[PDB]
Short mmCIF file of C-alpha atoms and ligand atoms in Angstrom, two decimals:
data_model
loop_
_atom_site.label_atom_id
_atom_site.label_comp_id
_atom_site.label_asym_id
_atom_site.label_seq_id
_atom_site.Cartn_x
_atom_site.Cartn_y
_atom_site.Cartn_z
CA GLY A 1 52.19 125.35 38.72
CA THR A 2 49.62 125.79 35.90
CA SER A 3 48.85 129.07 34.31
CA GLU A 4 45.33 130.40 34.58
CA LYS A 5 44.91 129.70 30.82
CA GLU A 6 45.98 126.16 31.39
CA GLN A 7 43.48 125.85 34.20
CA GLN A 8 40.57 127.17 32.14
CA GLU A 9 41.55 124.84 29.31
CA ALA A 10 41.57 121.92 31.70
CA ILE A 11 38.13 122.94 33.11
CA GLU A 12 36.72 122.86 29.61
CA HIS A 13 38.38 119.51 28.97
CA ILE A 14 36.75 118.14 32.14
CA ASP A 15 33.34 119.39 31.01
CA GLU A 16 33.84 117.55 27.69
CA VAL A 17 34.83 114.37 29.58
CA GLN A 18 31.69 114.80 31.80
CA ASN A 19 29.54 114.96 28.67
CA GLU A 20 31.06 111.58 27.69
CA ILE A 21 30.31 110.12 31.07
CA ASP A 22 26.85 111.53 30.81
CA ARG A 23 26.36 109.70 27.54
CA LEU A 24 27.42 106.32 29.06
CA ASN A 25 25.18 107.00 32.07
CA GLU A 26 22.21 107.43 29.70
CA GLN A 27 23.16 104.34 27.57
CA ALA A 28 23.37 102.24 30.71
CA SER A 29 20.01 103.49 31.97
CA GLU A 30 18.53 102.61 28.55
CA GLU A 31 19.91 99.09 28.48
CA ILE A 32 18.60 98.53 32.01
CA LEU A 33 15.08 99.77 31.10
CA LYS A 34 15.01 97.34 28.15
CA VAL A 35 15.99 94.47 30.38
CA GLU A 36 13.05 95.26 32.62
CA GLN A 37 10.78 95.44 29.57
CA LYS A 38 11.95 92.09 28.27
CA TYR A 39 11.32 90.40 31.62
CA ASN A 40 8.05 92.06 32.16
CA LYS A 41 7.03 90.28 28.93
CA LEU A 42 8.50 87.04 30.09
CA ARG A 43 6.70 87.06 33.49
CA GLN A 44 3.29 87.94 31.94
CA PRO A 45 2.22 84.43 30.96
CA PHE A 46 2.97 83.30 34.50
CA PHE A 47 0.89 86.12 36.00
CA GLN A 48 -1.91 85.10 33.67
CA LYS A 49 -1.73 81.46 34.63
CA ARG A 50 -1.62 82.59 38.28
CA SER A 51 -4.86 84.60 37.74
CA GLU A 52 -6.62 81.52 36.53
CA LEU A 53 -5.46 79.53 39.56
CA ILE A 54 -6.40 82.28 42.05
CA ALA A 55 -9.92 82.02 40.62
CA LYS A 56 -10.06 78.63 42.39
CA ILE A 57 -9.34 80.10 45.80
CA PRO A 58 -12.20 81.85 47.52
CA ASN A 59 -11.58 85.25 48.94
CA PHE A 60 -7.88 85.09 47.96
CA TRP A 61 -7.34 88.82 47.56
CA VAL A 62 -9.11 89.98 50.79
CA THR A 63 -7.16 87.47 52.72
CA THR A 64 -3.96 88.71 51.19
CA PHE A 65 -4.73 92.35 52.02
CA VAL A 66 -5.87 91.69 55.64
CA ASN A 67 -2.60 89.87 56.26
CA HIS A 68 -0.50 92.65 54.66
CA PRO A 69 1.24 94.90 57.19
CA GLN A 70 0.61 98.14 55.39
CA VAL A 71 -2.71 97.50 53.47
CA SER A 72 -4.48 96.13 56.54
CA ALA A 73 -4.22 99.45 58.33
CA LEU A 74 -6.31 101.00 55.62
CA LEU A 75 -9.23 98.58 55.83
CA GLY A 76 -12.17 99.16 58.07
CA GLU A 77 -14.61 96.43 59.07
CA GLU A 78 -17.06 97.23 56.33
CA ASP A 79 -14.26 97.61 53.82
CA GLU A 80 -13.26 94.02 54.56
CA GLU A 81 -16.76 92.95 53.94
CA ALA A 82 -16.83 94.67 50.56
CA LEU A 83 -13.44 93.14 49.67
CA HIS A 84 -14.92 89.63 50.00
CA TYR A 85 -16.45 90.44 46.57
CA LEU A 86 -13.00 91.14 45.06
CA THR A 87 -12.28 88.27 42.74
CA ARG A 88 -9.35 89.42 40.74
CA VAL A 89 -6.61 92.02 40.88
CA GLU A 90 -4.43 92.84 37.82
CA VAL A 91 -1.42 95.07 37.54
CA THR A 92 -0.47 96.37 34.07
CA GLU A 93 2.79 98.18 33.49
CA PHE A 94 3.25 100.14 30.30
CA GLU A 95 6.50 100.24 28.37
CA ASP A 96 6.47 104.02 28.04
CA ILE A 97 6.92 105.14 31.62
CA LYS A 98 4.93 108.28 30.81
CA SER A 99 2.04 105.86 30.59
CA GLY A 100 2.87 104.47 34.03
CA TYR A 101 0.82 101.56 35.25
CA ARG A 102 -2.73 100.62 36.17
CA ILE A 103 -4.30 98.46 38.91
CA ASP A 104 -7.66 96.81 38.16
CA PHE A 105 -9.95 95.33 40.85
CA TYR A 106 -12.71 92.96 39.67
CA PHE A 107 -15.84 92.65 41.84
CA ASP A 108 -18.69 90.22 41.83
CA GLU A 109 -22.13 91.60 42.11
CA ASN A 110 -22.30 93.26 45.54
CA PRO A 111 -24.54 95.51 47.59
CA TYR A 112 -22.11 98.50 47.61
CA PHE A 113 -21.55 99.60 44.07
CA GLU A 114 -22.58 98.82 40.51
CA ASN A 115 -19.08 98.68 38.91
CA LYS A 116 -17.73 95.40 37.69
CA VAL A 117 -14.19 96.72 37.73
CA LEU A 118 -12.56 99.57 39.69
CA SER A 119 -9.16 100.83 38.43
CA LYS A 120 -6.64 103.46 39.44
CA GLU A 121 -4.16 104.63 36.76
CA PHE A 122 -0.79 106.23 37.40
CA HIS A 123 1.01 108.34 34.73
CA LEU A 124 3.14 111.32 34.14
CA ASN A 125 1.34 114.45 33.14
CA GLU A 126 2.47 116.91 30.46
CA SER A 127 4.80 118.58 32.84
CA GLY A 128 6.55 115.35 33.79
CA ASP A 129 4.93 114.99 37.26
CA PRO A 130 3.26 111.84 38.61
CA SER A 131 -0.55 112.05 38.42
CA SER A 132 -3.41 109.54 38.72
CA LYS A 133 -7.04 109.03 37.72
CA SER A 134 -9.72 106.45 38.52
CA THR A 135 -13.05 104.79 37.66
CA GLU A 136 -15.99 106.71 39.13
CA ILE A 137 -17.54 104.43 41.73
CA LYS A 138 -21.38 104.10 41.28
CA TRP A 139 -22.38 103.39 44.89
CA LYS A 140 -25.78 101.89 45.39
CA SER A 141 -28.46 103.69 47.48
CA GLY A 142 -27.54 103.98 51.17
CA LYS A 143 -24.36 101.91 50.71
CA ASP A 144 -21.71 104.49 49.97
CA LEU A 145 -18.81 103.35 52.21
CA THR A 146 -17.31 106.79 52.03
CA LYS A 147 -20.24 108.39 53.82
CA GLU A 148 -13.41 106.25 62.60
CA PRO A 149 -10.87 106.23 59.84
CA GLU A 150 -11.75 106.85 56.27
CA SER A 151 -12.72 103.93 53.99
CA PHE A 152 -10.21 102.15 51.91
CA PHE A 153 -12.33 103.05 48.84
CA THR A 154 -11.42 106.71 49.16
CA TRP A 155 -8.10 105.64 47.69
CA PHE A 156 -9.71 105.49 44.26
CA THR A 157 -10.62 109.16 44.52
CA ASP A 158 -7.39 110.39 46.22
CA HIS A 159 -5.09 112.12 43.67
CA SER A 160 -3.54 115.01 45.49
CA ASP A 161 -0.08 113.46 45.43
CA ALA A 162 0.64 110.47 42.99
CA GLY A 163 4.40 111.42 43.42
CA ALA A 164 3.67 109.60 46.72
CA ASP A 165 0.81 107.19 46.56
CA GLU A 166 2.53 104.46 48.57
CA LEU A 167 -0.44 102.05 48.17
CA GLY A 168 -0.09 101.83 44.34
CA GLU A 169 3.63 101.10 44.71
CA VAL A 170 3.08 98.52 47.54
CA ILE A 171 0.62 96.67 45.27
CA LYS A 172 2.89 97.00 42.19
CA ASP A 173 6.23 96.08 43.76
CA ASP A 174 5.39 93.87 46.82
CA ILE A 175 1.92 92.30 46.67
CA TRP A 176 1.67 91.75 42.97
CA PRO A 177 5.03 89.88 42.53
CA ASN A 178 4.05 87.52 45.39
CA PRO A 179 0.68 87.65 47.03
CA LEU A 180 0.72 84.00 48.11
CA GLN A 181 3.05 84.79 51.05
CA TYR A 182 0.23 86.97 52.52
CA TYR A 183 -2.62 84.62 51.66
CA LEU A 184 -0.97 81.71 53.45
CA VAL A 185 -1.04 81.48 57.24
CA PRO A 186 0.98 78.80 59.15
CA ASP A 187 -1.04 75.99 60.69
CA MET A 188 -0.85 74.64 64.28
CA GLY B 1 -17.57 76.17 44.00
CA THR B 2 -14.20 74.47 44.30
CA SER B 3 -13.62 71.47 46.61
CA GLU B 4 -11.05 71.85 49.40
CA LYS B 5 -8.85 69.35 47.54
CA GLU B 6 -9.12 71.48 44.44
CA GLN B 7 -8.12 74.56 46.46
CA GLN B 8 -5.04 72.91 47.99
CA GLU B 9 -4.02 71.71 44.52
CA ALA B 10 -4.42 75.26 43.19
CA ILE B 11 -2.26 76.63 46.13
CA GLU B 12 0.48 74.29 45.25
CA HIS B 13 0.18 75.25 41.58
CA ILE B 14 0.47 78.89 42.54
CA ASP B 15 3.56 78.19 44.59
CA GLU B 16 5.18 76.49 41.54
CA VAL B 17 4.19 79.48 39.43
CA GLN B 18 5.83 81.77 41.99
CA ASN B 19 9.08 79.80 41.87
CA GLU B 20 9.04 80.43 38.11
CA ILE B 21 8.44 84.19 38.60
CA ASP B 22 11.28 84.06 41.26
CA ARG B 23 13.61 82.57 38.65
CA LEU B 24 12.85 85.36 36.20
CA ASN B 25 13.26 87.96 38.87
CA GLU B 26 16.75 86.62 39.55
CA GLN B 27 17.69 86.38 35.97
CA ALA B 28 16.58 90.00 35.45
CA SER B 29 18.60 91.19 38.38
CA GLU B 30 21.58 89.29 37.03
CA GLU B 31 21.33 90.83 33.56
CA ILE B 32 21.07 94.30 35.20
CA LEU B 33 24.21 93.72 37.34
CA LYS B 34 26.17 92.79 34.24
CA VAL B 35 24.98 95.96 32.39
CA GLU B 36 26.32 98.04 35.33
CA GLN B 37 29.55 96.09 35.27
CA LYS B 38 30.00 96.61 31.49
CA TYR B 39 29.50 100.36 31.77
CA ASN B 40 31.69 100.67 34.89
CA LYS B 41 34.46 99.41 32.60
CA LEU B 42 33.39 101.75 29.78
CA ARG B 43 33.50 104.84 32.07
CA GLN B 44 36.85 104.06 33.69
CA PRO B 45 39.15 105.50 30.90
CA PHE B 46 37.11 108.73 31.19
CA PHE B 47 37.57 108.85 35.01
CA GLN B 48 41.22 108.25 34.45
CA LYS B 49 41.52 111.02 31.89
CA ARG B 50 39.52 113.22 34.22
CA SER B 51 41.98 112.53 37.06
CA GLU B 52 44.88 113.70 34.87
CA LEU B 53 42.98 116.90 34.09
CA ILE B 54 42.02 117.59 37.72
CA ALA B 55 45.80 117.54 38.50
CA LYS B 56 45.95 120.82 36.61
CA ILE B 57 43.35 122.51 38.83
CA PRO B 58 44.65 123.65 42.25
CA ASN B 59 42.52 122.72 45.24
CA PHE B 60 39.90 121.10 43.00
CA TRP B 61 38.69 118.59 45.62
CA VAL B 62 38.45 120.87 48.64
CA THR B 63 36.54 123.40 46.60
CA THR B 64 34.16 120.63 45.43
CA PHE B 65 33.56 119.54 49.04
CA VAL B 66 33.09 123.01 50.50
CA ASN B 67 30.44 123.66 47.92
CA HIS B 68 28.64 120.31 48.46
CA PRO B 69 25.40 120.66 50.50
CA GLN B 70 26.00 117.48 52.62
CA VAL B 71 29.81 117.22 52.84
CA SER B 72 30.42 120.90 53.77
CA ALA B 73 28.44 120.38 56.99
CA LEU B 74 31.09 117.90 58.10
CA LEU B 75 34.07 120.15 57.54
CA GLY B 76 35.48 122.38 60.26
CA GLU B 77 37.78 125.34 59.65
CA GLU B 78 40.91 123.34 60.31
CA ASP B 79 39.61 120.33 58.26
CA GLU B 80 39.26 122.67 55.27
CA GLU B 81 42.87 123.73 55.74
CA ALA B 82 44.01 120.14 55.65
CA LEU B 83 41.91 119.33 52.60
CA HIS B 84 43.82 121.98 50.72
CA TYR B 85 46.51 119.19 50.59
CA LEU B 86 44.02 116.80 48.95
CA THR B 87 45.20 116.40 45.41
CA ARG B 88 43.33 113.34 44.17
CA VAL B 89 40.18 111.32 45.03
CA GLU B 90 39.55 107.86 43.47
CA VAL B 91 36.52 105.62 43.69
CA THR B 92 36.93 101.94 42.90
CA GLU B 93 33.87 99.63 42.66
CA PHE B 94 34.57 95.94 42.60
CA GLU B 95 32.61 93.54 40.48
CA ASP B 96 31.84 91.15 43.35
CA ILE B 97 29.60 93.25 45.52
CA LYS B 98 30.80 91.40 48.66
CA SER B 99 33.99 93.37 47.87
CA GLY B 100 32.10 96.56 47.77
CA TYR B 101 34.06 99.77 46.93
CA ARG B 102 36.95 101.83 48.15
CA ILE B 103 37.60 105.59 48.29
CA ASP B 104 41.15 106.75 48.19
CA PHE B 105 42.26 110.27 49.10
CA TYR B 106 45.75 111.40 48.06
CA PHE B 107 47.52 114.05 50.09
CA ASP B 108 50.66 116.05 49.42
CA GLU B 109 53.13 116.40 52.18
CA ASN B 110 51.30 118.23 54.97
CA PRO B 111 51.71 119.28 58.61
CA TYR B 112 48.87 117.01 59.94
CA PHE B 113 49.70 113.37 59.07
CA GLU B 114 52.43 111.28 57.48
CA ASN B 115 50.15 109.21 55.13
CA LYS B 116 50.42 109.76 51.41
CA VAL B 117 46.99 108.13 50.90
CA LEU B 118 43.99 107.64 53.22
CA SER B 119 41.38 105.10 52.18
CA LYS B 120 38.03 103.82 53.47
CA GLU B 121 36.80 100.40 52.17
CA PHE B 122 33.22 99.13 52.24
CA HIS B 123 32.45 95.48 51.94
CA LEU B 124 30.08 92.83 53.13
CA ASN B 125 31.30 90.73 56.06
CA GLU B 126 30.96 86.93 56.26
CA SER B 127 27.39 87.28 57.60
CA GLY B 128 26.31 89.44 54.67
CA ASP B 129 26.09 92.77 56.42
CA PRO B 130 27.78 96.03 55.43
CA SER B 131 31.10 96.69 57.07
CA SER B 132 34.10 99.11 56.52
CA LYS B 133 37.76 99.47 57.36
CA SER B 134 40.30 102.25 56.86
CA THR B 135 43.97 103.27 56.73
CA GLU B 136 45.41 104.15 60.19
CA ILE B 137 46.18 107.90 60.15
CA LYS B 138 49.62 108.63 61.41
CA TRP B 139 49.10 112.13 62.78
CA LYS B 140 52.17 114.29 63.40
CA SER B 141 53.00 115.57 66.85
CA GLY B 142 50.50 118.01 68.20
CA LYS B 143 48.52 118.12 64.93
CA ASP B 144 45.93 115.45 65.51
CA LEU B 145 42.79 117.09 64.17
CA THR B 146 40.64 114.69 66.14
CA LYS B 147 41.99 115.99 69.47
CA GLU B 148 32.73 122.32 68.32
CA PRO B 149 31.70 119.50 66.00
CA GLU B 150 34.01 116.49 65.46
CA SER B 151 36.57 116.61 62.67
CA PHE B 152 35.78 115.34 59.21
CA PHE B 153 38.73 113.00 59.59
CA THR B 154 36.89 110.99 62.30
CA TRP B 155 34.98 109.52 59.33
CA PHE B 156 37.92 107.29 58.52
CA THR B 157 37.64 105.72 61.91
CA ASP B 158 33.89 105.55 62.16
CA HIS B 159 32.59 101.98 61.39
CA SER B 160 29.76 101.40 63.82
CA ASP B 161 27.25 101.38 60.89
CA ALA B 162 28.45 100.81 57.26
CA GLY B 163 24.84 99.81 56.52
CA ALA B 164 24.37 103.57 56.73
CA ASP B 165 27.55 105.51 56.02
CA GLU B 166 25.83 108.21 53.95
CA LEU B 167 29.11 109.97 53.18
CA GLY B 168 30.62 106.99 51.29
CA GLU B 169 27.48 106.73 49.17
CA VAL B 170 27.35 110.44 48.56
CA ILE B 171 30.95 110.33 47.28
CA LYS B 172 30.33 107.21 45.23
CA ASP B 173 26.97 108.12 43.66
CA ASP B 174 26.83 111.93 43.61
CA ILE B 175 30.21 113.60 43.77
CA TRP B 176 32.25 111.04 41.94
CA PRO B 177 30.07 110.92 38.78
CA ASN B 178 30.27 114.65 38.49
CA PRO B 179 32.42 116.72 40.83
CA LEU B 180 32.74 119.63 38.32
CA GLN B 181 29.28 121.02 39.13
CA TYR B 182 30.41 121.64 42.71
CA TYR B 183 33.80 122.91 41.79
CA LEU B 184 32.40 125.57 39.51
CA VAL B 185 30.70 128.78 40.91
CA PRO B 186 28.91 131.22 38.68
CA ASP B 187 30.60 134.52 38.02
CA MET B 188 29.19 137.99 38.32
CA1 CA C 201 2.00 84.46 55.50
CA1 CA C 202 28.23 124.93 41.20
MG1 MG C 203 -3.23 78.01 57.20
MG1 MG C 204 33.63 131.20 39.12
#
């Protein structure tokens, strides 16, 4: 019962209404991002206290990883040995999501590599796509674990799809918020 | 270098710290839910204005669905005919998420069924699991579209996994926020 002029006029009116819904969608997403930023700051003193407490627990992080259903699948026998030198893991999330997040792994002096810290960083590149970069591992002579599944440590050098990279997100979103559940094993 | 007593004491201290992170996680999730509730109220006048404008556009909703990559796969030839009688679609989201959401479909008098409105409701049941329920369709004699893929209209009676029910979530989260993109087809 509407004329074709009335219909086109309604279509334009709907488009204007959609632009207004778009605006609210964006404002909502913005408020939500700020909430996450507020609470990332509120949790940080607690993660820092937890890091000091984990320093009291020998082999905390390798125990956590060996008991994790996804991470354990990536660890070979010699990788597990090397991870006994892992003293500290830190996850840092940047406010600007183009800056992404970083995972740092702190290692005591060990026979495999010279680095005191190994890190993998996740960010958006100039075209808006997920990318990653890492510390170059300075393996010691005859102890390159990357030279039979592939070593865990090839993760540091794997960048051909950060859009994916499940392991980074597992550490950021699962293990980092609560590693204690995986460290602890029921007694009998 | 820590005693086993010091280690157990640290483990308990970590558990306490985790409870404190847990609390912040929950407060963050709560603030985020309230933001979504605020903006659901702010968008509602715009969805209501849009409903009045869509009333001016013949066969708006069937056109939207036939041009939707997932919904079109569910529509048979006779379903499409029946959906030309669909005048109005409404999505209602309740604040308490145990109450879930509802989708209402308004139909002009048609040869297939007597109902003026067909609805599917999604909620959590007492055990916390997704469930759904619907209007009983009062098909007219010899015109039961459920009596060769199955009719679209069997969706109203399909409840054996609301945990899934992709179609409900596609309507709520994709089509409902912006159906105009699917209604509109470029000219040449
Ligand atoms: Ca456990
Ligand atoms: Ca289109
Ligand atoms: Mg034990
Ligand atoms: Mg056109």
